Design a protein around this nucleic acid. Sequence first.
RNA 1: GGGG
DNA 2: TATAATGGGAGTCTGATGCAGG
DNA 3: CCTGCATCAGAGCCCAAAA
Lengths: 243, 169
Amino acid sequence: VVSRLDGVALYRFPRRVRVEYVKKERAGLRLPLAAWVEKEAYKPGEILAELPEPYLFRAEEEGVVELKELEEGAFLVLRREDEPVATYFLPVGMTPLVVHGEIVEKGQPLAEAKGLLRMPRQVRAAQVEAEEEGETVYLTLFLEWTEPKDYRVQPHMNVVVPEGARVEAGDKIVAAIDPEEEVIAEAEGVVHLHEPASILVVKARVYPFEDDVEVSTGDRVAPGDVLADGGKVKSDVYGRVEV
Amino acid sequence: HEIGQVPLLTLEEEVELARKVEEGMEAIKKLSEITGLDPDLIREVVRAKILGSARVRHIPGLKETLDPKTVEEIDQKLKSLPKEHKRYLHIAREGEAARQHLIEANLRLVVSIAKKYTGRGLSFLDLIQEGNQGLIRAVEKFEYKRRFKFSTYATWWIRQAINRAIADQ
RNA sequence: GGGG
DNA sequence: TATAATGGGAGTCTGATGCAGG
DNA sequence: CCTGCATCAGAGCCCAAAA
Ligand SMILES: Nc1nc2c(ncn2[C@@H]2O[C@H](COP(=O)(O)OP(=O)(O)OP(=O)(O)O)[C@@H](O)[C@H]2O)c(=O)[nH]1
């Protein structure tokens, strides 16, 4: 598809809504000392440490493994009974040696770390607290990342939420004929629109507004006419109002 | 040639327009409560601004001569509403806009029904115009929730209109 | 279609 | 008032005048 | 400027005229 005219491209019917949910969690890691680069925070992609020879990251608790894998990098979570006893963060360059739902004992290797290990592209490190014991450092990492989830929109459904919107738990994203099949926002996240049915190219100007808008849809407008927000935003081109 | 200039609706497009018309009707009902006006009077005032200045006339049943003075007076009371009330004005306007498009996109359906009714004493175009009259009735009564395609419901109202036309004129 |  | 239905069928010869065209 | 060229409005009277 190649567009034939200048203007604003508009999404018609997104078939797939992807919600990137916001997660902020505190997870730990242990590394040698002669191998980690000291920083108080890590931007995504930043190198955390460099190991001369492979190092075996070991369990500091006994439990069953709940493995949660990101795009790159991993989370590993030990729980006894159902109470979580540990949260470990495995950066890139660290290969899990355990599988989901596996029993581990104190001291057994969870992951091999070889060479340069760096932050994954989707996950950050806010505050970094450290402790020094023997020849190793244990990082208490305050990590922030977004986990994607896709929702399918059917022909009788309409998306009620814009590209880039902020939702809390309970917010409606897609609406449908009957109460089931509705898409309700699971928790805090940001919204992205994908796979539109067609793209409508309109020759038009876009004038965003925060507060109440004084012109309603269908009104005709000339350059200088006040649009919304008590006179702050006003019209440039000659044209027809779409609210 | 003129009907062939409005593209036919996609299942999505059909449901979208139908949805906006229903919500708009509900909006006008609510706007009546809030404002203390008449639902029909509001609807004709809302409708006036969508089509433009071209069509302004007294409407049989409306309490006010529906001249530019009264539609400005009444529109200014509607645009003087608080943000949470004024959202319903925007809904009604967009409801009327979608109605226009919905009607226009289904005109070819009327032709295919009317061509079968030729030879009964009304000219082909007379049959189309009466057929179009039923289509307008059908757009106002359509309930999109039933998941039926529009063509199914319209046909009953269009067939009804032509047959009444032949019997009356 | 026929009369002048 | 609700499966869905979306673009039609059909018939000479004269002179005067106001019109798009080498 | 002039000429092809079309679109239009003309084409006798009276009587039966058996629909
Ligand atoms: N205008 C007109 N006159 C007719 C018509 N039919 C018959 N006539 C009359 O028929 C008459 C013909 O008369 P003829 O008998 O031919 O007159 P003629 O010149 O003396 O010819 P001969 O009697 O043979 O010598 C004319 O006077 C006409 O008025 C008609 O249809 N129209």
